[PDB]
Amino acid sequence: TQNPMVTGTSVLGVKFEGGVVIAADMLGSYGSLARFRNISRIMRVNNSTMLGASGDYADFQYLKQVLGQMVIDEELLGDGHSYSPRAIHSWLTRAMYSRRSKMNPLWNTMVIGGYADGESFLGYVDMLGVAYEAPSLATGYGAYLAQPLLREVLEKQPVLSQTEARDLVERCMRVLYYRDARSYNRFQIATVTEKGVEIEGPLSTETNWDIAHMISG
Amino acid sequence: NQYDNDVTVWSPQGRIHQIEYAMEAVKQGSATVGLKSKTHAVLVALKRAQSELAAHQKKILHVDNHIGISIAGLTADARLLCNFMRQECLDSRFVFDRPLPVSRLVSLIGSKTQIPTQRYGRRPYGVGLLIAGYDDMGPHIFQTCPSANYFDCRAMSIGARSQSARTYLERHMSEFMECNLNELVKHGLRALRETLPAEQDLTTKNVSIGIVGKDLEFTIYDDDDVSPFLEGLEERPQ
Amino acid sequence: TTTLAFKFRHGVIVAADSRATAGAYIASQTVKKVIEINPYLLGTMAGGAADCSFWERLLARQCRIYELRNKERISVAAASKLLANMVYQYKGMGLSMGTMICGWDKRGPGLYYVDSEGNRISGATFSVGSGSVYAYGVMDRGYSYDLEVEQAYDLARRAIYQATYRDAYSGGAVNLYHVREDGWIRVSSDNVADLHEKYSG
Amino acid sequence: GTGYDLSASTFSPDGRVFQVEYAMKAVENSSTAIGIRCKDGVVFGVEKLVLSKLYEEGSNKRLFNVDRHVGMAVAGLLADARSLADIAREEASNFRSNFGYNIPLKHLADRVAMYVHAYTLYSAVRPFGCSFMLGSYSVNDGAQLYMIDPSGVSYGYWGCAIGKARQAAKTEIEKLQMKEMTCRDIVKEVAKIIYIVHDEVKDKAFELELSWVGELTNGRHEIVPKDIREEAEKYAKESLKE
Amino acid sequence: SIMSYNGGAVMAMKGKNCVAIAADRRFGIQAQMVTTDFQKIFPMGDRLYIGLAGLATDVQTVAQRLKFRLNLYELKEGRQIKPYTLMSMVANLLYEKRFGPYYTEPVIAGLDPKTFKPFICSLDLIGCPMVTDDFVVSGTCAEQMYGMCESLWEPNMDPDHLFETISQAMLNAVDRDAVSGMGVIVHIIEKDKITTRTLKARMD
Amino acid sequence: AERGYSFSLTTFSPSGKLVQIEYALAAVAGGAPSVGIKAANGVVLATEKKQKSILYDERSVHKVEPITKHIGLVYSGMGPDYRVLVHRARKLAQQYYLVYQEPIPTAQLVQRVASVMQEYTQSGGVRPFGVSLLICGWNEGRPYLFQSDPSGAYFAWKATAMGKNYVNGKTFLEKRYNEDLELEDAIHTAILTLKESFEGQMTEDNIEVGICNEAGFRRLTPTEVKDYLAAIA
Amino acid sequence: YDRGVNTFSPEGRLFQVEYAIEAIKLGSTAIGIQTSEGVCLAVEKRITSPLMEPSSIEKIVEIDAHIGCAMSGLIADAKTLIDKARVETQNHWFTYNETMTVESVTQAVSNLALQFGEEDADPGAMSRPFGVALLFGGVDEKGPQLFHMDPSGTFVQCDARAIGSASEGAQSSLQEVYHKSMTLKEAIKSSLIILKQVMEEKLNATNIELATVQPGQNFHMFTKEELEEVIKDI
Amino acid sequence: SYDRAITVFSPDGHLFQVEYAQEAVKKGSTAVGVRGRDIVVLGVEKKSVAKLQDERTVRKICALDDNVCMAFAGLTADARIVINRARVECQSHRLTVEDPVTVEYITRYIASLKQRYTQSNGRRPFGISALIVGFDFDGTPRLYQTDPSGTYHAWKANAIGRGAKSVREFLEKNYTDEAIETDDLTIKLVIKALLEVVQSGGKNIELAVMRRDQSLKILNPEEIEKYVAEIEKEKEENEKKKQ
Amino acid sequence: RFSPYVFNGGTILAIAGEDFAIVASDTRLSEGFSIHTRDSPKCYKLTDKTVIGCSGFHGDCLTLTKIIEARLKMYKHSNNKAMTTGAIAAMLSTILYSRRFFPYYVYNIIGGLDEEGKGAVYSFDPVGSYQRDSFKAGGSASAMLQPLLDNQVGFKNMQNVEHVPLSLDRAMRLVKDVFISAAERDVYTGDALRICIVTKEGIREETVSLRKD
């Protein structure tokens, strides 16, 4: 896949005490055209993980399917295990990295978030097999707009309530929606706590244009 | 006529002889005993020597940092199954960054030893295993046959005169669940002892011990670390 | 990188510099550029260090099998022909490798120069590397087939000293080996700053 | 026989293939397993024999998940059972990739019969010494229960049994009605049948393994909770005394 | 292309009861001539010649790999080869290597053994049967030889008069080309006898 | 599933026979009788086509298959093994026509088919074909008649029989055959020499007759055969 | 009936391997004693004529510059294992740049020693098991070691072992002469004394091969005058 | 692919197929070899089987290279397979190593090549033994004998084929260093040993010699007849001057 | 088109004493002009006497480590011993070379103790090949650390000074020093500095803050 087709843009991720939050536009673009105006770029992966993916949506439909099959096939044995998030995040690095040696890269950036064993986990994966954990993640254009707001907040209060995180992500989608060309009004927030994987549906973002009356030339 | 020349011939009685005969290889071998508590799994195997000049042959194989096996049977075959397990557990660490679940490792050996038992001109592996393992669900003992079955055990023993060892394990099955470490190992020795003639008993050259625990990766105790667990035993009753 | 090697009446001198560069930046200047293949074949590095170290070392694993199966040391002529045939399958892949198998034989001193391009020539003098052209000069005005073992050490030090003084990718210290018919001995390892105060005045 | 049974590749002068019939006996030497299809799901009952106090109870299963919405209950040589269960798993994962939904049970039955049949035609192999039953619920097709034997034949069933006492338990299922009960009602009658056909004079003890798959669990296959298993064993000891 | 790399020219010209085929002989490496005698016409059983112009390597392989497929067909069956077949056998040996072609253009010039009906056809380098009844050419002097034949040909010639025409039309065609010349040879097949005359030409 | 057996099942006996090819011939000689008459003008292939009832259809199957536009087969032996050779021959013919742009000569098509039959007496796990072929054809101005045996050899005849009572038919032909017979008159001779072995009345459904003159091989339609049986044309 | 090469006997052991074990009981006799000062390997170069050149039938080989090997049985099979070991210690030295411990080279040739496949196998796999016994005796980092290796593909470390056609009579005579204080010079004489009983030829400076491996030296095979020097004392 | 076990162990500890292949050798035509100190000599029995034969196809003494000759006995068909695959080996080793093959090395390879067929699927073990003779690069004579087992030993004198047990004994009583002193005295020792087994001689003794750094020379029948006349002029005074 | 490599910075540093071997590094994992994360050690303990640094393409750093740790486990299963330093170094080369025509883009530095108990360092090219040094800087700020540091350890171009061996305390304070000065002028170094000391007592882990700019 040396050229993507329909891509999603940006995926925010932040840690908080008892879970993680993921965000992402519901938009899939094909050039400048915004061709598919309602897609889910976040998928539930068993009870303690979920993935948000930017980049080519077609390579994502294909993880969505192999990663799903790889989970079903875990629960048939019934032996109680299930994969951590820390496992699903490794397993993906190895897939990218091996599609990079054959030169058929999966053109995605991935955010695996999950909460297991009283521990939050936030994973990133590149189409090269760069991979790491961190308290904050953002992919694509979020790496330069939202990342500085998420990170500023965590270098002066390294914990967060589930209510300060919700707000930290709705303040960062607004900034993304202003300055990023391929963004969309409607976006999804996914939240993994110890109660499971909840996918809040199409939230909107209220804006303001007070500055449309200050340009006069 | 005869139905014992291939693994690919059923018998008019609904039994396959070439898989029964594999079973005799496991009883021709040396006795071994394994049991589990709730935090510790322990293998003790009765090493056996050829003469007074030769050294004793090794019956406990380190597989990973939480697995271990004790063979019994043809040893050539026992290292084809050891290299195939080492390879499953250096493969999972490589792909998932986690150790393989013991029960899952026995599933892979169950598939792979089934194949040659249904394929002309092959034969089943003449080696029975005892797998000691500790993961998230505590400890486990498994027992594999050359039939390709397996059983999740509470405590087992295979090899020569293991009928006797199983008797001792069916009389003290209650204590095990709540023993401390030293007491568990001593149980397994008393059971392993009953496999010999009353004309001898365990020394430091007959026994090796393999422990895998909650905080303790699989370890092997050779010939001079067997003294702490071999001492503090009473003498076998006449 | 500047190796040079010549045979004379008492054996073969092999002399090297020691610098090795990442291009413009001197990575390490302690590189031993004479590869003890056996206890009786020297080799040299002069192309890419990766490429020589590996293929070179692999010629050792070949020559030790040969020596156990046939129960006799392997010719120099022969060892060079293993190393041409290994590297000739990767022609065009972009290996560099300017090696000089050098030893002692059932035909006296033997010196071959094997390339990665597929050359295999026996000679009497050679120089391989980036300073090789500077070595040929000063080496060939002093070289004769008959010398003393003390003339020859002093011709080779001098002819590496002059290469590392014109050229830029040569420097470090001058290793110096001497293959006698019982095995090679490590003669000297003089630095090039030291040699500078012995020759100037 | 003399040459009429060494190979799977030899018809008898009758027309029978003794190597396929010999595999049938390996099913007759294994304990019983029964399957009963109600009107909103399936229930699987396995008479797993406890042979020592050395085995961990609740292990050495004979109830598998071939897929998240399919049960398999086996009888016969277990080694082959664990071989079939991986060919199915493989097949039903395969189907979900190329067609993008769950594989209908009628179909999975045929694919696994195919694969069993191919092992009765060659010298390189012996037939499987293993019979089994596939059970699945959907909300768009109903409850279904197929049963495949070494021959490779599949049939639909309303109730089915396999193992050493297949004759006795088929009768006790025919007295039972089933086309009108829910799962909650059947599960007790399954346990009851098992206790009647089992011998505690031929076997030390036994453990009763029960499986939903029906409207209760939402089409998923799962074992029966410990609570409803204790009740179904208690209701079977009382009807056994009477 | 890489078939001007050795020059070459072949011309075959159908008479009335006879067929002539002529080539030049200059084997050279671009400009530098190596030798002046180098056969571009091969016999394929009597009364049937195949000429090959172009890259000298595929000249010799096609002529050697065609003798190996013809001899094995002329033994396994007893019938001697018929010229209309030999064409399709050659079309199939070029097209066997569609991708990565041969750089030769065959010119087949024979009489039917069972009868005597004359027959000529050329082939594109990938294998095309181009049967005419006038005259065929292949080579690097293609344009020049077409000119000369289109004006000197006549529908019916005796075998002495044919040889005058092919000669005239081969000497003047090859003289106006750089990479050909150095003398031409000319077979002229009749029913009874095969004459082989070499023309005096430019050793320019 | 099996890779196949590799060892041959045809094998020499201490006397020097290839016992399997010996038995294949006895399958042939049990088959439906068939005769061939080359008429120095054309070839005629006739064979009996008797059924076990009135239930069958006669326009389903035939025993005179065309291979090219001037090469026909008939056989006796095993109808299955015959349908295999027919198919292989047609691919050989076409393969040949693809490379030389001529239609396969009949001398050629007998060696090629023969070799395939030969190959199955020296490969693994297979038995020989229980068939013999009559391969007529009209190439190069003449006619041709050949006969391929399960062995893998062939012979060029001017008349012959095979199948049932071929010892009776072969001597009936050795007497009643005169070179330079007409093509029409050969047809009378064919059905005639097929009448000795045959049992029961002849009809247009019982015999398949197929000619082969410079116009090309063909079957005779049931109508033409009704005027040869009568003999009223 | 006929049974392939993979068939268990109702006993419990493989037919073919049971017979490979009898194939040794025809072979030469080799006695290796392992001490604290080195391993010595002695064997009998069974000649058959005086025409035969006694110096070209050796049955001690150098596997590396620290691992001798003495085989007895079908010497023709041996040349396939030995070659595979030399390749093995070398490969090992090509990757890790150290010597192979004598235990690990024994293990690599024992995997090869059991794997033959009538059907379902490569075209180059072996049709039958190897008919050899080996005595690897090197010195490495655990001090001197000696390993016995049998055609069953199993290996047990030793102290003093005899293989071949006179294993029983030599093995009993070893148990009475071997103690842990034995030195390398006392061991060489103990070898030739026990070898001189069981040879139905005679002890002679061309009828034996003697080779040591010592912690301070490489594998060194005794020439013909160093054999004569130890036959004076016997 | 025809994969089968052909060679398998006897329950007795033998190996039937190789015991049998050494029966095939024993049916073959005797061959003998002695190494001089500057001459090595092969002589093979029976070259006359008609007056209709060609004398270039009946050979049983071939050249692998210029250092190396090879006589054999046993199945003449199998031998022409080994001889060839050796010849190829002789150049492959002249390419990669500059020195020519030595005689130990070309044998080691013929040995191992017979041994492969004694332990691979489908194959029947070669049915020949061999006498390989040659001069090393240093100029010493070497004689070898291979077996269908895949084993080999150097020899000084040897014999394979029918009546090798008789000849072996003859060569133990007649080979010292008072026989073998000059080149012509070695050739006679070979002929005296063959004449024990053959009925006529000088008409069945095919004989070939190789000396120092010259190539093989097959002796025409007149050179062999002269030497067989020398044996009858010696048989007169080896009994009349001893009486 | 598609680049199979990207640069990710990271610097590693290794000083071989005569009783200790220090392996240092920054933890900043940058890509392009943003800072992906601030906490990613470039140091991975292997056995008890061996550390390895990996800098360069964090995609291959990560793979290459799991390949060492998997033939390192493989060796202890076949030979029944722990793998020495000089063994790993020789092995790492054969792995790197195995992909010569699409290489690992990794600078490696193995520090540890040989069998005399003294310090040993091995530096690598990306394509294989290693020598035995007493100090090697690697990675992005290799040219900041080489000229200074290699003066203080080796005493090059000095005159009339004492060639005193390196104390465990004189080095540690050196490492912390050179890094503080390379994180001022080089943009791929900072955030924090992870030192690994390898003596025969175990492996200590320090951490010091660098410039977060």
| CATH number assigned to the domain comprising residue G34 | 3.60.20.10
With contact defined as beta carbons under 8 Å apart, do I46 and I71 qualify? Answer: no
Place of tokens 């026979």: F17
Comparing alpha-carbon positions, the chain G residue that sits nearest to I87 is G96
C30: chain I residues, CB-CB within 8 Å: 131, 133
Comparing alpha-carbon positions, the chain B residue that sits nearest to A87 is B96
I102 close contact with A: CB closer than 8 A: yes
Give the gap in angstroms from C-alpha B221 to the nearest C-alpha of chain D. Answer: 26
Burial of B149 (0-12, 13-18, 19+ CB in 10 A): middle
What's the Cα-to-Cα distance from I119 to each of F177, I23, I85, I125, rounded to whole Å? 108, 11, 10, 21
Comparing alpha-carbon positions, the chain I residue that sits nearest to C58 is I94
CA angle (E73 as vertex; F103, E81 as ends), nearest 5 = 70
- Joined together, the tokens standing for residue G156 give 């047990």
Sequence letter at residue A60: F
Residue H41, helix vs strand vs coil:
strand
Q: What ranges in chain A are assigned the alpha helix state H?
A: 57-75, 85-101, 147-154, 162-179
Chains that touch B (3 or more CB pairs under 8 A): A, D, G, I
CB within 8 Å: G128 and H9: yes
Q: Order across the sheet with C11-16: list the strands.
A: C125-129, C2-8, C11-16, C173-180, C183-191
Total count of domains within chain B: 1
Q: Where are the beta strands (DSSP E) in H127-205?
A: 128-135, 141-146, 152-155, 157-160
CB within 8 Å: G123 and H1: yes
The minimal CB distance from D55 to the residues B118, B120, B154 is found for B154
CB within 8 Å: H3 and F124: no
Size of interface B-D (CB pairs under 8 A): 89
What's the Cα-to-Cα distance from G209 to each of A54, G32, I163, rounded to whole Å? 75, 12, 57
Instruction: Kindly state the helix (H) or strand (E) to which residue F111 belongs, with its residue range.
Output: helix F106-119
Total count of domains within chain D: 1
C4 phi, psi to nearest 5 deg: -155, 155
Angle A57-75/A85-101 helices, nearest 10 degrees? 130
- Report resolution (Å) to 1 decimal: 3.9
Comparing alpha-carbon positions, the chain C residue that sits nearest to H94 is C78
CB within 8 Å: C61 and G86: no
d(CA H147, CA H19): 11
Residues 6+ apart with CB under 8 A from I80: G103
Cα–Cα nearest to I128, from C174, B94, G99, C56: C56
Chains that touch I (3 or more CB pairs under 8 A): A, B, C, G
CB within 8 Å: H99 and C75: yes
d(CA D89, CA D99): 16
Which residue range is the domain that position A212 belongs to? 1-216
Chains B and G touch (3+ CB pairs under 8 A): yes
CB within 8 Å: H156 and G5: no
Q: Order across the sheet with B155-158: list the strands.
A: B155-158, B32-36, B40-46, B207-213, B219-221
G161: chain B residues, CB-CB within 8 Å: 53-54
CB within 8 Å: C77 and H98: yes
Chains C and B touch (3+ CB pairs under 8 A): no
Residue G101, helix vs strand vs coil:
coil
Provide the CATH number for the domain around residue A177.
3.60.20.10
d(CA B3, CA G173): 46
Torsion angle (degrees, nearest 10) of CA H190, H196, H200, H201? 0
Residues 6+ apart with CB under 8 A from H45: H29, H30, H31, H161, H194, H197, H198, H204, H205, H206
With contact defined as beta carbons under 8 Å apart, do B70 and B231 qualify? Answer: no
Characterise E181 by phi-psi region: left (phi > 0), alpha (psi -120 to 50), beta (else). Answer: left
Which residues of C form the catalytic set? 1
The DSSP bridge pattern shows strands C11-16 and C2-8 to be: antiparallel
CA quadruple C93, C94, C95, C99: dihedral sign = positive
Place of tokens 């800098």: I55
What is the radius of gyration, based on Cα positions, of chain H?
19
d(CA B148, CA B145): 5
Chain-centroid distance, C-alpha D149: 10
B155 close contact with D: CB closer than 8 A: yes
Cα–Cα nearest to A51, from A19, A18, A92, A15: A92
Comparing alpha-carbon positions, the chain D residue that sits nearest to F3 is D124
Chains D and I touch (3+ CB pairs under 8 A): no
C107: chain H residues, CB-CB within 8 Å: none
Q: What is the residue extent of each domain of chain I?
A: 1-213
H233 phi, psi to nearest 5 deg: -80, -15
Q: Order across the sheet with C41-44: list the strands.
A: C34-36, C41-44, C102-105, C108-114, C120-122
Which residues in A have their CB inside 8 Å of a CB on B?
Answer: 77, 79-81, 83-84, 86-87, 90-91, 94
The minimal CB distance from H13 to the residues G19, G75, G128 is found for G19
Give the Cβ contact number of residue A195 at 10 Å. Answer: 11
d(CA A59, CA A73): 21
d(CA A126, CA A111): 9
With contact defined as beta carbons under 8 Å apart, do H97 and C78 qualify? Answer: yes
Give the Cβ contact number of residue H163 at 10 Å. Answer: 17
CB within 8 Å: B90 and I74: yes
Cα–Cα nearest to A17, from A209, A175, A160: A160
Cα–Cα nearest to I142, from I158, I120, I125: I125
Comparing alpha-carbon positions, the chain D residue that sits nearest to A62 is D97
C70 close contact with H: CB closer than 8 A: yes
CB within 8 Å: A79 and B137: yes
With contact defined as beta carbons under 8 Å apart, do G144 and G182 qualify? Answer: no
d(CA I131, CA C151): 32
CATH superfamily of I1-213: Aminohydrolase, N-terminal nucleophile (Ntn) domain (3.60.20.10)
d(CA I28, CA I35): 7
Comparing alpha-carbon positions, the chain F residue that sits nearest to H2 is F6
Chain-centroid distance, C-alpha A15: 12
Total count of domains within chain C: 1
d(CA G129, CA H13): 12
Which residue range is the domain that position C76 belongs to? 1-201
With contact defined as beta carbons under 8 Å apart, do D203 and D49 qualify? Answer: yes
Instruction: Kindly state the helix (H) or strand (E) to which residue A131 belongs, with its residue range.
Output: strand A131-133
Q: Where is chain H discontinuous (C–N over 2.5 Å), named by the preceding residue?
A: none
CA angle (E86 as vertex; E84, E91 as ends), nearest 5 = 100
With contact defined as beta carbons under 8 Å apart, do I183 and I211 qualify? Answer: yes
Cα–Cα nearest to F138, from F167, F116, F107, F117: F107
Chain-centroid distance, C-alpha C191: 18
F7: chain H residues, CB-CB within 8 Å: 2, 4
Cα–Cα nearest to F101, from E74, E122, E88, E96: E88
With contact defined as beta carbons under 8 Å apart, do H35 and H56 qualify? Answer: no
G96 close contact with C: CB closer than 8 A: no
With contact defined as beta carbons under 8 Å apart, do F33 and F198 qualify? Answer: yes
Which residue range is the domain that position H50 belongs to? 1-239
C68: chain G residues, CB-CB within 8 Å: 62-64, 86
CB within 8 Å: I29 and A101: no
Provide the CATH number for the domain around residue C184.
3.60.20.10
Angle I85-97/I58-79 helices, nearest 10 degrees? 130
Which residues of A form the catalytic set? 1
d(CA D11, CA D20): 11
DSSP-assigned letter for residue G121: S
d(CA B151, CA B131): 10
Residues 6+ apart with CB under 8 A from A55: A4, A7, A8, A107, A108, A109, A127, A139, A140
d(CA F153, CA G65): 66
DSSP-assigned letter for residue C9: T
Q: Order across the sheet with H141-146: list the strands.
A: H61-63, H68-74, H128-135, H141-146, H152-155
CA quadruple D131, D137, D143, D144: dihedral sign = negative
G20 close contact with B: CB closer than 8 A: no
Give the gap in angstroms from C-alpha C78 to the nearest C-alpha of chain I. Answer: 25
Sequence letter at residue H57: T
Residues 6+ apart with CB under 8 A from I41: I25, I27, I194
Give the gap in angstroms from C-alpha H2 to the nearest C-alpha of chain F. Answer: 5
What is the radius of gyration, based on Cα positions, of chain B?
18
The DSSP bridge pattern shows strands B207-213 and B40-46 to be: antiparallel
d(CA C75, CA C41): 9
Sequence letter at residue C61: R
Angle E83-95/E56-76 helices, nearest 10 degrees? 130
Provide the CATH number for the domain around residue D4.
3.60.20.10
What's the Cα-to-Cα distance from B131 to each of B57, B138, I9, rounded to whole Å? 19, 14, 45
- Joined together, the tokens standing for residue B149 give 């079955």
Residue numbers belonging to the annotated binding site of C for bortezomib: 49
Chains D and A touch (3+ CB pairs under 8 A): yes
Place of tokens 């056969």: E39
Total count of domains within chain H: 1
- State which approach was used to obtain the coordinates: cryo-EM
d(CA I114, CA F80): 78
d(CA B111, CA C152): 71
d(CA C144, CA C9): 9
d(CA H1, CA H192): 50
With contact defined as beta carbons under 8 Å apart, do H240 and H203 qualify? Answer: no
Provide the CATH number for the domain around residue B153.
3.60.20.10
Q: What is I24-76 written as a DSSP string?
A: EEB--EEETTEEEES---SEEEEETTEEEEEEE-HHHHHHHHHHHHHHHHHHH
Residue numbers belonging to the annotated binding site of C: 49
What is the radius of gyration, based on Cα positions, of chain G?
18
- Joined together, the tokens standing for residue A141 give 């254009």
Task: Write down all domains in chain F, each with its CATH number in brackets.
Answer: 3-232 (3.60.20.10)
d(CA E41, CA E51): 4
B86: chain I residues, CB-CB within 8 Å: 74, 77
Chain-centroid distance, C-alpha D205: 21
Residues 6+ apart with CB under 8 A from E63: E42, E50, E52
Chains that touch G (3 or more CB pairs under 8 A): B, C, H, I
Size of interface E-F (CB pairs under 8 A): 20
Place of tokens 């080309």: E177
HSE toward the beta carbon, residue C64, CA cutoff 13 A: 24
With contact defined as beta carbons under 8 Å apart, do B151 and D60 qualify? Answer: yes
d(CA F154, CA H110): 45
Instruction: Kindly state the helix (H) or strand (E) to which residue E19 belongs, with its residue range.
Output: strand E19-24
A80: chain D residues, CB-CB within 8 Å: none
C78: chain H residues, CB-CB within 8 Å: 96-99
H156: chain G residues, CB-CB within 8 Å: 51-53
CA quadruple D45, D50, D54, D57: dihedral sign = positive
Sequence letter at residue D207: E
Angle A57-75/D78-99 helices, nearest 10 degrees? 160
Burial of H226 (0-12, 13-18, 19+ CB in 10 A): exposed
Which residue range is the domain that position D178 belongs to? 1-239
The DSSP bridge pattern shows strands H141-146 and H152-155 to be: antiparallel
CA quadruple E23, E24, E28, E29: dihedral sign = negative
What is the radius of gyration, based on Cα positions, of chain A?
17
What's the Cα-to-Cα distance from E48 to each of E39, E108, E127, E153, rounded to whole Å? 16, 8, 19, 21
